[PDB]
Amino acid sequence: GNELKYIEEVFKSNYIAPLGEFVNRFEQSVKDYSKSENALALNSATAALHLALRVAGVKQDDIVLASSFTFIASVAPICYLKAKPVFIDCDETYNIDVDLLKLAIKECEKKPKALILTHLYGNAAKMDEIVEICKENDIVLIEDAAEALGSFYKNKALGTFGEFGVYSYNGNKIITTSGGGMLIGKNKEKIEKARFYSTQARENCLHYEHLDYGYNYRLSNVLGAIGVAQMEVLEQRVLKKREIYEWYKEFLGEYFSFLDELENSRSNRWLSTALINFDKNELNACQKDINISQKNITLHPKISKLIEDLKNKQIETRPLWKAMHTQEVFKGAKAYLNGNSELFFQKGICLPSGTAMSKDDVYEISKLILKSIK
Amino acid sequence: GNELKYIEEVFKSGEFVNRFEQSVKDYSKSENALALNSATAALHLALRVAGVKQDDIVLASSFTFIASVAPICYLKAKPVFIDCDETYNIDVDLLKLAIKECEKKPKALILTHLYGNAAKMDEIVEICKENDIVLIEDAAEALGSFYKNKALGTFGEFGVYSYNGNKIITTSGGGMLIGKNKEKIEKARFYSTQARENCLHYEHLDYGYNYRLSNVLGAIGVAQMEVLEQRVLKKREIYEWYKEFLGEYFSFLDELENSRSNRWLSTALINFDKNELNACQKDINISQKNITLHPKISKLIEDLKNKQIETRPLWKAMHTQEVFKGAKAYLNGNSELFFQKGICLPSGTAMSKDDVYEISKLILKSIK
Numbered sequence A: 001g002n003e004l005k006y007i008e009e010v011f012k013s014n015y016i017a018p019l020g021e022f023v024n025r026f027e028q029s030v031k032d033y034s035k036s037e038n039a040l041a042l043n044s045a046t047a048a049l050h051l052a053l054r055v056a057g058v059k060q061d062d063i064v065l066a067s068s069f070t071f072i073a074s075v076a077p078i079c080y081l082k083a084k085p086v087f088i089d090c091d092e093t094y095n096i097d098v099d100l101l102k103l104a105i106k107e108c109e110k111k112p113k114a115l116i117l118t119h120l121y122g123n124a125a126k127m128d129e130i131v132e133i134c135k136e137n138d139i140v141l142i143e144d145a146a147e148a149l150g151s152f153y154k155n156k157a158l159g160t161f162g163e164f165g166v167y168s169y170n171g172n173k174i175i176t177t178s179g180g181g182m183l184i185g186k187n188k189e190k191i192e193k194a195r196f197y198s199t200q201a202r203e204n205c206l207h208y209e210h211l212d213y214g215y216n217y218r219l220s221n222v223l224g225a226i227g228v229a230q231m232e233v234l235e236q237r238v239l240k241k242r243e244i245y246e247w248y249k250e251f252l253g254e255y256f257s258f259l260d261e262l263e264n265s266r267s268n269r270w271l272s273t274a275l276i277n278f279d280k281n282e283l284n285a286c287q288k289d290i291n292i293s294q295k296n297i298t299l300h301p302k303i304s305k306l307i308e309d310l311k312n313k314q315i316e317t318r319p320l321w322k323a324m325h326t327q328e329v330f331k332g333a334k335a336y337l338n339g340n341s342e343l344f345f346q347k348g349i350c351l352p353s354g355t356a357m358s359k360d361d362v363y364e365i366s367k368l369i370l371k372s373i374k
Numbered sequence B: 001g002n003e004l005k006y007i008e009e010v011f012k013s014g015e016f017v018n019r020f021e022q023s024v025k026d027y028s029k030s031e032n033a034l035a036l037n038s039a040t041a042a043l044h045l046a047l048r049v050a051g052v053k054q055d056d057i058v059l060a061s062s063f064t065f066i067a068s069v070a071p072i073c074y075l076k077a078k079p080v081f082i083d084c085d086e087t088y089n090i091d092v093d094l095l096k097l098a099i100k101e102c103e104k105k106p107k108a109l110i111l112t113h114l115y116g117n118a119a120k121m122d123e124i125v126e127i128c129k130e131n132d133i134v135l136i137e138d139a140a141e142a143l144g145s146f147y148k149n150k151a152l153g154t155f156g157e158f159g160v161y162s163y164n165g166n167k168i169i170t171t172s173g174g175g176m177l178i179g180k181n182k183e184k185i186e187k188a189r190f191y192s193t194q195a196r197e198n199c200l201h202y203e204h205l206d207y208g209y210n211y212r213l214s215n216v217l218g219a220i221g222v223a224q225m226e227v228l229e230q231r232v233l234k235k236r237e238i239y240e241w242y243k244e245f246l247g248e249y250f251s252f253l254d255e256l257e258n259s260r261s262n263r264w265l266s267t268a269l270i271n272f273d274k275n276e277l278n279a280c281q282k283d284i285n286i287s288q289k290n291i292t293l294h295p296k297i298s299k300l301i302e303d304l305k306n307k308q309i310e311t312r313p314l315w316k317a318m319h320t321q322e323v324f325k326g327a328k329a330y331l332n333g334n335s336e337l338f339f340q341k342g343i344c345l346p347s348g349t350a351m352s353k354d355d356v357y358e359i360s361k362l363i364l365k366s367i368k
């Protein structure tokens, strides 16, 4: 895209242009796309979530509901504020199950202050129900749409349903080319308070004056430039991601299950995923509450062999997220299970979904998979 | 100026993050380096790996930027601030006093090397050693500074460097955490990427952060390090020119003997004399405090601003900030005095001797 062009512009005009020009443009491009009225460009989605929780009023020992089937970066902010996480298993969309959410809220001795809802692999959660449950229980809804930029629910962009929404831009490898997150929200005052915290909580004075403490979370102009470049081709990439998903479905549909997106929703399919030897009757094996303890989850034989085989053909595939309710870090925390996230880890596979791939690449990969599973 | 070159290579496809860390090890001689999003993040990780917990006591420089002490707040630890000496850094005697009076042994000391000036390292290192206090050097503005030919940041168990100034929004970004213990630095590298165990899937025994620098900013970092020494020499030239043109009315305090300040920011004091140092000795329970700038300083800043020339007051000490209300601070009156009579001058390396001369003339005109 125009990444190099914009970065060159940043260095060339730094001496004369307005402050944070590309950061401003990046925020505006997200506002234009999502239709949110407020946007704040930060160093990461984790930082965006951290600020969202703080401006929402979350304090030490407060209760925060969160998805169990997710990446730990979505819930670590709860730990930063020393709040207590309550994890909820998922449904057929890979997202928080409505039944379990209601159960958790009903049984909480202390009322939860907020809910961090993850839209896993770009799939939309059942928003109408979740939004209502949060409203009726006075729970602040914070959408973790880190991998859901470009996803929609009934023509509305994921991230714009809760009081706060968060987007990420570069995947989750340990080291990435670029970096950055965007915090969006309904309340201008709260978002502007976050913009204040994002730069060390400075008062408007000639010198440095501080009434509170903040962070160093503001995005740089160089990364903002890359962000603008990425937003310019977002829709195109979303369309390509979906084409890739459909190709995988076409070539593997006979042996793998490709769970449908919610009706009247549009998943960005940022990463294509599939389940082997799966039947919907396997869902919701239980409905129990537990105190978390670490546990390993055995990969289905075909999945472990698949990853190994494709690995020898220079193709990288990965297991799905390992639920938070099975992680040692959250030992002792409350969790509500139905068995779905563990089942998905057991039979799921994350497939190569780079938009640079052609139909032949997807076909060749699929051919190698079919050969391995039989 | 290889920034654009390296960036292009990045796009043509963590190479540069690794090269950035290597360049810092090559320059500072530290055996361990970790590239992060900011110096604040680096200090945050240093404190955590150092073992700081909620309610632990952490000593810190009062005359500094809040970004250097905010991490204490992140871990809910308790700060104890210490005033400065003629180097702009922590006064050795006040440091000993604070340690002597502490109800319980402080876990660490965050020592700032203000405006690049070296602190009295031999004494401070010894004090921390004798009291089993972890020394963490905030060398955010001191990359290129040395004490007895040893790079600032390499005296403590941990050291932190920053790269792009304090503008509310900067072109680039980044920080570097260096340290003496490989295991501790590798633990920080672990925390910097969400505390992932080394395996195919995601497994976590602890929680971490997303503090790891991106490859693009790493590329910029490498380019900045390659010209660091040249920049420092120019910064020092600029400092000397200001001293030559303004030395009759402004005081430019000398760097410690056998030390080398990078003079990243040229600063000076008006109507100042060493005799007014250490005038008000006492300790307090912090309360917000307004400090009026010396009449000539405030006017100077105004005049230069009307000439499109930006100057700024020196850092306003933490012991005068509302955010730290209640916290303990040991003072001698120096950081407040420096704030009232100090000025931070334009220090861009692209400035020529004539440019500094012209700025100096406007300054002399302003103060009459």
Ligand SMILES: Cc1ncc(COP(=O)(O)O)c(C=O)c1O
Residues within 6 Å of the ligand: A043, A044, A045, A046, A047, A070, A071, A073, A074, A118, A119, A120, A144, A146, A147, A168, A169, A170, A171, A172, A180, A181, B210
């Ligand atoms: C579902 C999800 N939530 C949160 C995050 C955290 O975002 P970041 O990596 O930008 O800190 C990620 C990683 O991108 C993610 O995939």
Ligand SMILES: Cc1ncc(COP(=O)(O)O)c(C=O)c1O
Residues within 6 Å of the ligand: A216, B037, B038, B039, B040, B041, B064, B065, B067, B068, B112, B114, B115, B138, B140, B141, B162, B163, B164, B165, B166, B174, B175
């Ligand atoms: C003296 C000092 N300490 C700490 C910091 C914080 O560093 P960063 O802005 O990279 O988080 C700065 C800003 O550069 C600084 O000037």
